[model samples]
Target: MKIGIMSDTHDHLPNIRKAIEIFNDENVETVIHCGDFVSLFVIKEFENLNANIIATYGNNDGERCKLKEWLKDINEENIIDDFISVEIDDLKFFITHGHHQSVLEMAIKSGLYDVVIYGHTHERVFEEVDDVLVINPGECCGYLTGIPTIGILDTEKKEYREIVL
Candidate 1:
């Protein structure tokens, strides 16, 4: 399956919309957003795309109440506290925003997930740690560093590629 990984939209709805369109064109099966959406409307933008959205919060997204309201009645657990663990196509993944230092240490020590994905540094990186993939998909909205990119992971093949858009 193809999974699209993205981060740091920071209310760039037009850019996110473009990313959604690109993902749709790619026929991606799922999406993982690494946070800093900056507004609740961005959540609706993802939801409307009809992809399974697994996400975490970033430092700049200060609208927690509205975020909660937007995510209410859905899977609240997935949207909480900036920590999430999930399995896709038999491969487990831990996802979060890189604002927390514990993310890397936990992934390194646990050696449980097939991959750990995070964002915050707004730089793309991929490496193997204890046979697990550790990744940061970079910023899709051109927020920090003025760089814009996302990642695509092929779960079955255990491979990923960065797409600069």
Candidate 2:
């Protein structure tokens, strides 16, 4: 199955729209947001997603309660938190905002996750350590790096790409 990956969308609605379009166009089964969404207003475009979003909180996500409520209102399974794990097609994955490097490292070293995904540095990354894939999908807003991008992961094949917009 194909899954969408994105992060650090600091209210960049245009890029968010593009990412959604790309995901749908690619026929992704689900979408993951690595945090820093800024506000719930972005939900306008999020509602347009063809798949449910699995998200986490970022340092800039000050209004966590409202954001979580709004997203969860759409799908009972659309969960938002500090960190989360989801098993897709027997591949274990962990998702977070990567605000704390220590925590991220700990997760990676734990040797429990098949994939560890985070987004806070606004830099696109695709790396492998042992048997796990570590990825940071960069800035969806293009505010930091001046380049907008997102990620697509093929779970069945254990392959991924960082798509630039």
Identify the runs in model 2 with alpha carbons over 4 angstroms from their true place. Answer: none
What digit string (tens of lDDT, one per residue) describes model 1 on residues 15-134? 798888888888578788876887877778766564567778788889977776676444444354578888888988888898987765787578888889998888888988778899
lDDT of 1: 0.80
TM-score of each: 0.88, 0.97
Candidate 1: clashing residue pairs, number = 0
The count of residue-pair clashes in candidate 2 stands at 0
Candidate 2 residue pairs that clash: none
Local accuracy of candidate 2 as per-residue lDDT tens digits, 76-104: 77888898987897888888998989989
- Separately for all candidates shown, the number of backbone clashes (residues 3 or more apart, or on different chains) is 0, 0
* Deviating ranges (above 4 Å) for candidate 1: 72-81
Model 1 is weakest, by summed lDDT over 10 consecutive residues, at 72-81
